[PDB]
Amino acid sequence: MSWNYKQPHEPQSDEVAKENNGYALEDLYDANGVLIAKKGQLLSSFAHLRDDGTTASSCWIYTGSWTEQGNQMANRDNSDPSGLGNTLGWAWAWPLNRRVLYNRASADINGKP
Amino acid sequence: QARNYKLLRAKEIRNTCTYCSVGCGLLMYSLGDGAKNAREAIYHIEGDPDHPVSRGALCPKGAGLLDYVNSENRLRYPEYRAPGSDKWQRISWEEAFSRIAKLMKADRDANFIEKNEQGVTVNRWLSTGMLCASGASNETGMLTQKFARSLGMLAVDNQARVXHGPTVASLAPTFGRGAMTNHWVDIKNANVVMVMGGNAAEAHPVGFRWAMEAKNNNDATLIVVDPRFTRTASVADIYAPIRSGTDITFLSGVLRYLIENNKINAEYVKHYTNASLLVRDDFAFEDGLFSGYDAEKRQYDKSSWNYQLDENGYAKRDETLTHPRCVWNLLKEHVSRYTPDVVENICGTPKADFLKVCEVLASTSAPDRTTTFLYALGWTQHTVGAQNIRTMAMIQLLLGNMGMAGGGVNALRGHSNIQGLTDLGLLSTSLPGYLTLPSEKQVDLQSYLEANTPKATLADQVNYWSNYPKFFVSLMKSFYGDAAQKENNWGYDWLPKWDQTYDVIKYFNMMDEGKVTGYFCQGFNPVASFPDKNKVVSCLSKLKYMVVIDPLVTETSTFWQNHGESNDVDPASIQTEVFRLPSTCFAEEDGSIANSGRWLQWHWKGQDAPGEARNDGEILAGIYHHLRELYQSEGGKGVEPLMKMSWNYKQPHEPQSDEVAKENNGYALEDLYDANGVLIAKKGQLLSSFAHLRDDGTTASSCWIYTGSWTEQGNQMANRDNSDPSGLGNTLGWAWAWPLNRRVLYNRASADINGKPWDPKRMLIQWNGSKWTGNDIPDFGNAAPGTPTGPFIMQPEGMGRLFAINKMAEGPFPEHYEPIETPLGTNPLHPNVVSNPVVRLYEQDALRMGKKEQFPYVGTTYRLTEHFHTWTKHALLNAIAQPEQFVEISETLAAAKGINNGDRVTVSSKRGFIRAVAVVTRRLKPLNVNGQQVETVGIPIHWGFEGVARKGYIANTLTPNVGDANSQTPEYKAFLVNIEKA
C-alpha cells in the first residue's frame, strides 16, 4: 500500500485531495490523436480514466474536484444567473458539478421543459 | 476620546456618481454585511481614492448623494391619477402593467402605419412617443431601444436632443466622430485651457481639477470667455466678456487673426485638413447667404458646396495652396470680414481683451504647445449651435492641436450616461453604434446600405464606414436571431422607416394639434427641461395617457396638479390618465454608464430600492410582456415586427445587466477564421473586436463600437488598474473606452507625416517599422509614415474639414446670425439676414416671440455648482447649499430699476414670468454693442414646485420654443426678457 506523502508522518490535505481527484500517469490522447492530458497532470474528468494502468484516482466520482485549474472545492462565486438558486461557481459537486441529478427528466421526450 | 469610526464593519460597494459626465468613483457604505436577514441600507457615501479621474474627490452633488438615495421624495409604489382627478391612487404592479398595455394596444391598433402613400412598408407608430433616461445604465438603454423600435416608435429621444446634439452635428462632419476627443486627466497636459461656451468649474468640478493642474503645475494659461464672471472666471488668468449668441463672430475673428499673422501649424494644415482640396466654381457667399438658397422652403440646395472631382472621381487638390478655389483661400476670404472692430461691435468684447485671447491662442500654433477647449451648452443651445462648434474645431485644426495630449476638443457631456444613450441610438432616427434607421425612400436592403456606406473621396484612405454592412447585419442578428436570414434581408422590413425626424419640439407641436395619444417619460422631466413651460403643460394636458418612470417625484408627474403661480392649472379640466412607476436609482442596480471621455464604467448594487420600486428593465419587461401577450391572443396591427424582437434573457421579466452588456459587446454565431485559415473565434464566444464582425449573419452585436468591452477575457468595464507608465495621465487599464480602448481620438495626428511627434515630450504613438505602438492605442490602421493615408479614419477623405462640404444645414463655413430674440433687432454684419436663414420656426411659436421694445434685456439660463437640474432640490444637503431661487443682474440695471441686492423681482418674457431674489453683482456688466448698452439677466435652472428646497418657478417658463437648424436643440442660452421690482 502506498503512502506517498512528502512527510510520511504528516500527510497533507492537498496531497490526499489530489490523489482522490486523480492523475494521468502517461500522456493521454483522444481517438482523434489530440492530447487530452500530459504525464503527471491532474485529470479534469472521470471520462479520461482508463483501464490500462495509465491513470490513477482514489475516488473516481471526485475527478474534477482539484484539476490543473486548481482546487475547485475552494471556489466562492455565488452567482445564480437563472434565478433558480443554482450556483455552479460555489465549491464543487459530484458528479462533474451536476447540481440536480437526473436533470434530463426536467424536459419531455422532445426536449421541451 | 473621539466617537468610533462609523464605517468599520459596514459593507463597502464601488459605484459611480449619478449626476454629471465626469464619472467620479464612489465608495458607498451600507448597514449590514450582506447576510440574507439584514436588509442593506446605504448610510454614507464618499469618493474612491484609486479612481484616476476623481482620486477621491466629489463635488457638492456627488458628496451629497446619500440625501438623494434616501430622499423623502423617493417613489415607493405604482400610482395612478384618473382623468380630471386631483389625487394619486396607489395600484399594484400588475394593475399598472395591464392598464398601460391595454391603453398602448388600443392606440397602436388604431394608429399604426404599415405602409406609406407610395406603397412602401414602413411599420411606424407615431401617436405614442418616449423620452429616455440618460441617467440610467447602458443596459437599460438597450432594453429601451428594443422596446421602442419593436413597437415601431420614431418619436424616441433622450436628453441629447436638448443638449449636445449640435456637437455631434458639427464634430462628426469636421473630424469624423461627434464625441469628446480626449479625456479628463489629459487636460493636465495643456499649455492653454480655454473655457468658453461652458463653465467647467461649476458644471464639471472634479474633472476641472485637471485644468487647475495644467494651470498650477504645467504653467498653463486659463482663459474664460463668458457673459458672466463665473466661478471658473474666479481662478482664470484671463477673463473676457461676450454677449450671448455671438460666439461665431468672436471665433471667426480668431480665425482671421491666426491666418493674418500666420500663426498656424502649416505642415499640419497642409496634410491633415482639406485646405488643399478644390471647391466647385459655383460655390459662393454673399450678404449672409451661401449659394443655393431656396427662400420659400428656407433650406439650401447644397450641390455647389462640394469638391471639384478629378478623372478618377476623387477630390482635386492643389498642394501649393495657391489655387483660388482651394478650401484654404476660400476660408481666408470668408473670415476676412471678422476684424477686431467687428468683434467688439457685435460681441461687446473690448478689443484689448480680444487681443489678449488671440495672442495666447496663437502661441499654441507651435508644434510643441497646445490649447484644449472645454465647452458645452454655452455653445450648443443656440439656433446656430452647431456652427459655434464648427468655428472652434476649425481653430484647433489651424493650430495643429487635434490628436495631441493636452489638446483636442473636450466637449464636456452632461448627464452621467448621455454618452451611452447617444452611443446606443436613443434619438428619433438612430440605431445603436451611430447607425441610422431606414428612411421610407429606401425600399430595400441594398438601397439602404448604399445610402449609409460612403465611398472614399481621396485614394488610400481608411474610410472605415465602408464597413457599415457588417455592423448593420450584426445588429439585426442581435435583435432577431434566427429570424434574421439572408432570405428575408436580415429582417430589414421590421424596422420602422422614417419620413422625417421626430424631434421633441416637432412632436410637441403635433401633441398640441391632438396627434399624440400617449407619452413615456423615463428619467426625463420635460415640464422642467423643455422650452416654453406654459406651452409644454398645455401640450401634455392633451394627452390621453402618460407613463412616468423615475426614482423621484417630478414636476412632470404632477403637471396636472395646481401649485399656485408655479403651476396654475385646473385638475378638473385635464383628462390625462397618469401612471407613475417607482424605479431604482444608480445605487440599486449593477450596470455600466459611459462618461465624457467615452469610458464605459461598471458599477455595483449597494441596496434594494425602497418600497415596491423596481429596476428599469423590470418595468419595461412587465409592460412589454403584458402587451405582447395581448397581441398573441387578440392579434392586431404590426404584429410581426413586435413579436420577432428577441428578449433572450434567462428570466424574461428580470433581464440582467451582464446579459445585455454581453449582447452589446457581441458574439460569434459560428466558428470564425481569418484569411490565412486561423481560427479567430469559436461559435458562442464573445467577440474581442469589431474588426471581427461580418455581414453574412455569422456575428451579432447590438452596439458595434462597444465590441471589446466584455470579452472572453472578462468584463473590461470593471478593470481597476490605474497605472500611467508615460506620466501623461493615460490609464489604459481603468475601465474600457470606445473605440477599442483608444483614449485620445485622432492620435495619429500627434505626429507629423514622417511619424515624428510634434512634441517629443508628448508621444502618443510611433512607428516601429511594421506597426504603430505607443502610450495610447493607435486610432489608426497600419499605414506607414509618408503614405497618403489621413489621420481622421472615419472621414472619406481622411482629413479634418475646414470646409464642411454638404454636411451642415446652414453652410460649409460658420457665419454670424443673431438669436431669434435679439436685443439689437438687427444683425450688424448683414441686416438683410438677421437670424439663421434655415431655422425652423412654427407659426404658433413665432407668435410667442418678443421684441426688444417690450423685452430689452438678454436672458440666458445656466447652472450653479450646488444643484443638478431640478433633481438635487429633492436632497436636503444640496437644498441647504443653495436653498432659494435667484436671478443675477448688474449693478447698473439694478440701479436703473431701483432694485437693491436681495430684493424680490419679476423676470418676464413674451411667454411667461418667474419671481425671484435678485443677486446684484459686478460679475454681470452691460456691454457696448452696436451703439447700445446691452444688459443680461441671468436665470439659474434649479428650482421648481417639487422638492425640499424653497418652492420656486420653472426657469423654462421664460425660454423660446425654437432651436438649432441642424438638431433642433433649443435656444435656451440667448433670448429676451424684461425685469420689474416685486
Ligand SMILES: Nc1nc2c(c(=O)[nH]1)N[C@H]1C(S)=C(S)[C@@H](COP(=O)(O)OP(=O)(O)OC[C@H]3O[C@@H](n4cnc5c(=O)[nH]c(N)nc54)[C@H](O)[C@@H]3O)O[C@H]1N2
Ligand atoms: N452643477 C451642475 N453640473 C452640471 C449640470 C447641472 O445641472 N448642475 N448638468 C450637466 C449637463 S446635463 C450639462 S449639458 C453640462 C453643461 O454644462 P455647461 O454648459 O458648462 O453649463 P451651463 O451652466 O449651462 O452654462 C454655460 C455657460 O455659458 C454662459 N453663456 C450663456 N450664454 C452664452 C453664450 O451665448 N456664449 C458663451 N460663450 N457663453 C454663454 C453661461 O453664463 C454659463 O456660465 O452641465 C452638467 N453639469
Ligand SMILES: Nc1nc2c(c(=O)[nH]1)N[C@H]1C(S)=C(S)[C@@H](COP(=O)(O)OP(=O)(O)OC[C@H]3O[C@@H](n4cnc5c(=O)[nH]c(N)nc54)[C@H](O)[C@@H]3O)O[C@H]1N2
Ligand atoms: N432653461 C434651460 N433648459 C435646459 C437646459 C438649460 O441650460 N437651460 N439644459 C438642457 C439639458 S443640457 C438637459 S440634460 C435637461 C435635463 O433635464 P432632465 O433630464 O429632464 O432633468 P433631471 O432633473 O436631470 O431629471 C431626470 C430624471 O432622471 C431620474 N433618474 C435617476 N436615475 C434614474 C434611473 O436609474 N431610472 C429612471 N427611470 N430615472 C432615473 C431623476 O430622478 C430625474 O427625475 O435640461 C435641459 N433644459
Ligand code: SF4
Ligand atoms: S456631479 Fe460630476 S463632478 Fe460632481 S461628483 Fe458627480 S461626477 Fe463628479
Ligand SMILES: [Mo+6]
Ligand atoms: Mo445636458
